[PDB]
Design a protein around this nucleic acid. Structure first.
Ligand SMILES: [Zn+2]
Ligand SMILES: [Zn+2]
Ligand SMILES: [Zn+2]
Ligand SMILES: [Zn+2]
Ligand SMILES: [Zn+2]
Ligand SMILES: [Zn+2]
Lengths: 186, 590, 396, 590
RNA sequence: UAAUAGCUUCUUAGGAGAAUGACGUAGCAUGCUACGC
RNA sequence: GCGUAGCAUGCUACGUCAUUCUCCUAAGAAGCUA
């Protein structure tokens, strides 16, 4: 605003008008300077108003260009995270058994529901009470999915280790059911 | 995506779309560049163009922003204003963009095409951030230049050990050696794909190639060969970490009963453990490779990373280490593509091993205790930055001789790159001198060794030997045919075979030439084992025959001549053209 | 193509009247984006239309409730209001009915999509909503079926299902009658043609479909919000068996939801002046506003008092920080002032006096942490009943 | 961003900018502070600078709150009202504040530069919140003092084992010792960056310093050093938790037949368990450091955190624990920089172990069953608050003897600090007496232990040995030579050397002197190991040669002389200068 | 860890429109006066 | 009567600003319902 020469033009016109007024300039001269002051003031506000649009306009650009810049910066991070997740999950695959089962497929396509059931190397069984425990996985080894598994760990709801001997009918109330038992494929 | 200004590191989001690399530039630096250079295309988060329904204006100073878009003067709204004003370019962090006068050199760095030698020398004396950008854009220029290459395909199935070449008409051909590989492409009907990459060498006569097979998938005429171009990734790490010397060796624990073989270098070895990065230089055939294993044995319980630009040098170091170092605790890192006949003698590709060998290109991002870079002469600043980035070690050991040959530097066609500006390491070594040196030699006769020491070196070599009196240097014209991408001298071999009947000594000699075409041809009429000049530098011999084909700067290269003549031990018959070279060395006249 | 999708189970942490845990399905964004892009035009068309059978997007304020209930009474002959309930609605949903709802919603794509595109959209909908992989505490199970309450079309699909069940009940009721006891000849002919078009005809008879639709709109006018139904059925026909009654709904639920619908959770009202007994958990009452009588919805006072006392986060306990909370609660509870039972009416005055007390205490604390009281304070209008009375006037 | 007024704990939002710590003050208390002292800058949520277009008026009584902001006399709108008026200064919670005349002491705390001795004793006899604030202010003053410290640099390096030093001309030279450490700079073009942590101690011959580095980085001549500094976070925890007397043991569980060594020490552990916190005071090497491990064995299941302020003492404590406590359930925490080489034998840096040993500065914020702090003498109240805050424990046990050398307190240069004012714990130890005491000596002969049983201790210590008649007191004038700003007594050195070849059984006795200059310069001439009194603490030697450099308040310190003499094992020769010191002890005649 | 959809209340920012008021420039209509014809 | 100039009054257009209101969007906080 003040930077533009319109401010200086208005200031000098106003100064001349005041000097003429205090100097007792004639009415014809007085009107001339006042009219000159008006047009000088007219330009001063005319280019002043456009500034409001300008700095206003710039702010949205910054906010917009902040936002667009902000988004892409976040886009790369999430893309890298997703790629890392995919590759880490890949490295967990049992390539041998997976290949053996998938090659047996006539069309090379198999239902997903059997991918773990025929290749997963670790079995988790969640048991609500002692009767189901005894029915399903009594002993240090058991059978499921037409395969043999051996118990390697047993934990309670609190993620506290539990010894197999502790899982007894009389000791059942003292255990924080349900039990998560983890076994391996043999 | 925001970044840092190249020449002032200030936060910015502006890129010079005209520059090949589109490097980041701040408001002030960007204005200085656009107003200074002819580059008038600049990329913010969005390109700076006239977003009119129909219009195409790319100049930035002629662009004004209106509404939420950019236009020229003829499509702007009633509202202002210029994008390029107030000594700044409109963008992010407008109030933290510091300008620098370094734009003067930045303009030359960006605008040059690397045709002349001045670019390289000025591309090496610039600051670190400009150094990285210059290296990146130079490599990009190299790759783009490689995109203009001659493509070929196999004529038909001729031999299992050798194919034939059918190139396109109107395009050049590349040099044929291990460095240059090519990719077969399978566009038959039917799904252009890859089956394997081949390396080619000139055939026997006319048109033919003796090749190297990567994949056993044999190809019909449905495929054709290209020079396997690729892209270039950006770099962040410095060419050389700051030189910070040490008081007493840290992280490197000396050994017990190291050896009697190389106890003379113990001081050097501790000095190798002293500087953060150490620079050792030794003339052709002086055990710097031997020095590497010596250092490795000096610190037994430290993880050591061997690095070299090419497969040949790293493979030689691997073999020597297998010979001396324990063989079990080794891990040679192999590229997944395997575009070369790889080295599989250790327990290969174990990145979590003590003694890990790798090439510059295939280094995975890891950490170590000490890393030894070898053959820095052929190494480029890009390689230096890459090794600085991917690898972090407590100690660095750059071993190499700038008196050797340079990197290919194909784009350089006018001017000669002197040793001082091969790269940052070579400049350092030619500036303050190598941190270490070993000047003992045991191979060449007395007159030759003395004269060679007199040519370029400062008279510090002597042979613990007497001249075998079988070293010669003649003046044979050897009329030149050179009707192939490299020069040939067959009648020179005729003049030689006029000899070789009165001198039964070197009847098991190795032929060497400064042109690979003569190297290929000389093995055809006579079955002399062949070894080009590059394939030397690491082996010693007693009967070698070297022949000079042309007369030019490439022929008078004292480095090439030195590496050529220092490989024989008792006998070498030479074909030589220039009296200038003839008056520096003493030989029998015959 | 088909994109199978994982949906999480989230425990709903919200005030409730029964201890059974409430769960919602968080559907993956990959399915939500496509479902929105495929359905939102129709969904917004429904939500932005007044006077239809599906009342979604119709505000209950500004006399909206009265307009709604007057639309229900679409000139039925001997009105009787009635409402049913679906036990385990979202979990006993048969797969076939969910597929039917998806197809009905998809029928509008007669031009924007070819046949295969519609079929694959339906397949994606089923694979992502109907029978997908469900994550429950970091473990992938298979959902046997039933609608998940998280997809883009959750309320509208259930609305379509509810209308389907109502029409099925009407069809079964009309068929199961003797036939010789229907004195009205028109209805006997309608039953005959209905049976013909059901079990003796393979292409749609649009004439008869329109006739039956007009019949239902004339004697079984409906209001549906995705599982809450209010019907204004003719009682004479229902007694004669010519339109669905409660028992018909019970049978229909029995053999098409595998659930039993106890009559205790369905309500019948023989007097319209009392309005529906309950709808969207809002009781209804007729009160004299201005110079004429209008319907007002009021909530169960226990719910409002509970929302006043118990809050789901600690910071809401301060109160002074949250005046808008109590303003909204008072807006919801205003109609209770007109209730004949005084203890009902006292809830609104409690909320008003409490809002006034928070305003006073907030001003005190503000004048303690400073020494100047806020120049502009329009809060005085929030403890005057007129501002709330305006929310239930049809002017806006 | 509100807080509580320090000396009345009323809600407030006003802080004194002129105060270094910028503490929270209420309207009344802030008024009293500013009106009397030079402090005339107050910080509310907004600073109280006059917000004129251009004006700088910070005095509060000069300002008015007018319009929306604070303005000066000639910059305020006509609607003004004084800020600092009506006996108050405008701030939040204006009419809910209350203060007292105790500000008088707070005024002294704010004003004092911590140069005079009265400052500390007043700072250690104030109210609890005043105590905390005084500690914060003293630490801030110490930190700020470093800003004016001089800059060193390296002249050259003739020997890598000993650096050659150069101080910046025109600035004071800080003393060379372990307490002070340096970080470097390479400001040339080219790396104005740190080059590692080093330490210094003067060299005997000429100008030279035998140095040591946390890292290994050698210095180019351009590289130089400056004393390190680290910012300070305000402390909040009280110096000591209030004491609560329990009826029985709660939360701790005894042992079954702990051992035959700690059998007399059982009621001590009982008293420790009964009370919330306890204090143990006794002469050096009397079982104090052994007491903590005995307690640990007495309460095995209890998680225990041993803490010290220094690194040498905690290392010996860890050694003792290894000697007795199980190696498995032990840890050692070192700062990230790890300035000094600490105890590396356990699973290092394992905070979650049952028994954890650490220095105060590098403590992590965790809990425990009991925290045992050793050697209170070297620790300040700031350390006390730090330990009270970071480590949360059921029981707190403090060990250390006031008569031991106190914390550095470098700013202190006038008067003497008595033991009862070293810190709050020492104040408790001296005021009412320690909660526990033990005294017995097992190391030095009967004579010098008999003397120290009267020097500082009031005939408390019996001993177990026989006077070997090798206790010697020598009286020589010992002309002074104030050479390195620490006195060097060359003629006393002459006496030492002249009666060291006359004493065959004293050819290895460790030379001891209060001043480092004489201590070092004696090395090149009599060759015996050299050890200053300050770092001599915690080390025992077969034979000792002490030398009173000069008569003054530093060398004649009874505590320093005690800790010097109490390091001998079978005998000691000492050189006395003051007659009173030579007489109060009872040695041989000479 | 915290779903889809709808309705409503409140606060802030932006744009547009409208109404009223004020000031300035310009255009046009009328009235009075000075000079020339 | 005509032309130029000046002053007064009135209407229209444009520009600037103040207040009030309506809506359109965006952001945030909160409640209710299925
Ligand atoms: Zn450019
Ligand atoms: Zn810049
Ligand atoms: Zn344009
Ligand atoms: Zn102060
Ligand atoms: Zn106070
Ligand atoms: Zn002022």
């Amino acid at each position: 605003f003040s930077s533009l020469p319109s401010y200086a033009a208005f200031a000098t016109a106003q100064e001349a008008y005041e000097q003429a007024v205090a100097n007792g300039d004639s009415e014809v001269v007085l009107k001339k300077l006042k009219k000159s002051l008006n047009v000088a003031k007219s330009e001063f506000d005319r280019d002043a108003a456009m500034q409001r649009k300008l700095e206003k306009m710039a702010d949205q650009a910054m906010t917009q260009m902040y936002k667009q810049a902000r988004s892409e910066d976040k886009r790369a991070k999430v893309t890298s995270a997703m790629q890392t997740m995919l590759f880490t999950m890949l490295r967990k695959l049992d390539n041998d058994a997976l290949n053996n089962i998938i090659n047996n497929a006539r069309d090379g396509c198999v239902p997903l529901n059997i991918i773990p059931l025929t290749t997963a190397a670790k079995l988790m069984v969640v048991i609500p009470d002692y009767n189901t425990y005894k029915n399903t996985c009594d002993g240090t080894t058991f059978t499921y999915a037409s395969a043999l598994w051996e118990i390697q760990q047993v934990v309670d709801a609190d993620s506290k280790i539990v010894q197999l001997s502790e899982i007894s009918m009389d000791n059942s109330p003292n255990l924080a059911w349900p039990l998560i038992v983890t076994a391996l494929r043999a | 995506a925001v970044g840092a200004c190249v020449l002032c590191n200030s936060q910015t989001s502006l890129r010079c779309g005209a520059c090949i690399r589109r490097p980041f530039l701040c408001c002030k630096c960007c204005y200085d560049h656009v107003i200074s250079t002819s580059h008038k295309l600049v990329l913010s988060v969005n390109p700076y163009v006239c977003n009119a329904p129909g219009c195409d204006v790319t100049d930035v100073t002629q662009l004004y922003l209106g509404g939420m878009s950019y236009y020229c003067k003829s499509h702007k709204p009633p509202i202002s204003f210029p994008l390029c004003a107030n000594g700044q370019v409109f963008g992010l962090y407008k109030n933290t963009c510091v300008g620098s006068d370094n734009v003067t050199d930045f303009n030359a760095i960006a605008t040059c095409d690397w045709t002349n030698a001045g670019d390289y020398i000025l591309a090496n004396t610039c600051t670190e951030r400009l150094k990285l950008f210059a290296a990146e854009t130079l490599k990009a220029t190299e790759e783009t230049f490689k995109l203009s290459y001659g493509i070929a395909t196999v004529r038909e199935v001729l031999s299992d050990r050798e194919l034939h070449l059918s190139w396109e008409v109107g395009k050049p051909r590349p040099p044929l050696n291990r460095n240059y590989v090519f990719t077969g492409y399978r566009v038959t009907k039917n799904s252009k794909v890859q089956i394997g990459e081949y390396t080619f060498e000139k055939g026997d006569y006319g048109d033919a190639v003796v090749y190297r097979g990567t994949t056993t998938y044999k190809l019909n005429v449905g495929d054709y060969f290209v020079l396997t171009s690729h892209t270039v990734m950006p770099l962040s790490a410095p060419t050389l970490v700051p030189q910070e010397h040490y008081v007493r060796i840290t992280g490197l624990y000396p050994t017990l009963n190291i050896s009697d073989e190389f106890s003379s270098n113990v001081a050097n070895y501790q000095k190798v453990g002293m500087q953060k990065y150490s620079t050792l230089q030794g003339p052709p055939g002086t055990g710097k490779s031997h020095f590497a294993i010596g250092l490795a044995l000096y610190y037994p319980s430290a993880r050591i990373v061997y690095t070299a630009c090419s497969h040949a040098a790293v493979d030689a170091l691997c073999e020597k280490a297998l010979k001396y170092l324990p063989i079990d605790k080794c891990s040679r890192i192999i590229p997944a593509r395997a575009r070369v006949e790889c080295f599989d003698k250790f327990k290969v590709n174990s990145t979590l091993e003590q003694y890990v060998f790798c090439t510059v290109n295939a280094l995975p991002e890891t950490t170590a205790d000490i890393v030894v870079f070898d053959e820095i002469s052929m190494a480029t600043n890009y390689d230096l930055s890459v090794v600085n980035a991917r690898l972090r070690a407590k100690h660095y050991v750059y071993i190499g001789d700038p008196a050797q040959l340079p990197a290919p530097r194909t784009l350089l066609t006018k001017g000669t790159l002197e040793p001082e500006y091969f790269n940052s390491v070579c400049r350092l070594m030619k500036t303050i001198g190598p941190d270490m040196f070993l000047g003992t030699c045991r191979r060449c006769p007395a007159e030759i060794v003395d004269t060679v020491s007199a040519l370029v070196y400062d008279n510090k070599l002597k042979a613990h030997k007497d001249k075998s009196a079988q070293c010669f240097k003649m003046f044979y014209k050897g009329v030149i045919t050179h009707d192939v991408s490299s020069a040939i001298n067959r009648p020179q071999i005729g003049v030689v075979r006029e000899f070789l009947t009165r001198n039964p000594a070197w009847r098991k000699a190795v032929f060497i030439s400064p042109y690979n075409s003569q190297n290929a041809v000389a093995s055809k009429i006579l079955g002399l084992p062949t070894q080009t000049v590059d394939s030397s530098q690491g082996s010693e011999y007693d009967y070698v025959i070297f022949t000079q084909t042309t007369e030019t700067a490439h022929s008078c290269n004292v480095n090439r001549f030195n590496v050529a003549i220092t490989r024989a031990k008792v006998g070498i018959l030479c074909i030589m053209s220039d009296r200038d070279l003839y008056d520096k060395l003493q030989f029998t006249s015959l | 193509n088909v994109i199978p999708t994982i949906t999480q189970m989230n425990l709903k942490y919200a005030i409730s009247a029964k201890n059974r845990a409430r769960t919602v399905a968080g559907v993956s964004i990959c399915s939500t984006m496509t479902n929105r892009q495929f359905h939102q035009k129709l969904l917004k068309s429904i939500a932005a239309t007044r006077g239809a059978t599906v009342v979604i997007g119709t505000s209950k304020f500004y006399g909206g409730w009265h307009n709604m209930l007057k639309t229900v009474y679409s000139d039925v002959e001997n009105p009787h209001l009635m409402g049913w309930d679906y036990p385990k609605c979202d979990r006993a949903m048969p797969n076939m009915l969910r597929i039917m709802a998806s197809l009905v919603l998809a029928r509008k794509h007669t031009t924007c999509c070819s046949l295969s595109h519609r079929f694959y959209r339906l397949a994606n909908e089923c694979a992502q909503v109907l029978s997908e992989m469900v994550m429950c505490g970091g473990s992938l199970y298979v959902k046997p079926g039933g609608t998940s309450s998280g997809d883009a079309t959750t309320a509208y699909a259930n609305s379509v299902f509810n209308i389907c069940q109502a029409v099925t009940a009407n069809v079964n009721a009309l068929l199961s009658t003797d036939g010789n006891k229907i004195a009205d000849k028109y209805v006997r002919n309608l039953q005959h043609r209905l049976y013909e078009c059901l079990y003796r005809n393979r292409d749609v008879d649009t004439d008869f479909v329109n006739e039956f639709y007009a019949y239902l709109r004339k004697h079984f006018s409906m209001m549906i919000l995705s599982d809450d139904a209010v019907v204004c059925f003719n009682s004479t026909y229902a007694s004669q068996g010519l339109v669905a009654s409660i028992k018909n709904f019970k049978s229909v639920l029995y053999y098409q939801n595998n659930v039993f619908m106890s009559e205790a959770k369905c309500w019948t009202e023989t007097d319209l002046t009392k309005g529906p007994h309950e709808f969207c958990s809002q009781h209804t009452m007729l009160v004299k506003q201005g110079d004429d009588y209008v319907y007002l919805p009021y909530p169960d006072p226990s719910r409002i008092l509970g929302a006043g006392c118990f809050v789901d986060d600690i910071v809401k306990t301060d109160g002074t920080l949250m005046i808008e909370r109590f303003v909204s609660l008072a807006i919801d509870a205003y109609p209770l002032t007109k209730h004949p039972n005084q203890e009902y009416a006292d809830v609104f005055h409690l909320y008003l006096q409490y809002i006034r007390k928070l305003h006073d205490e907030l001003t005190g604390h503000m004048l303690d942490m400073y020494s100047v009281m806020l120049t502009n304070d329009n809060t005085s209008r929030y403890w005057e009943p007129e501002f709330y009375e305006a929310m239930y006037t049809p002017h806006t």
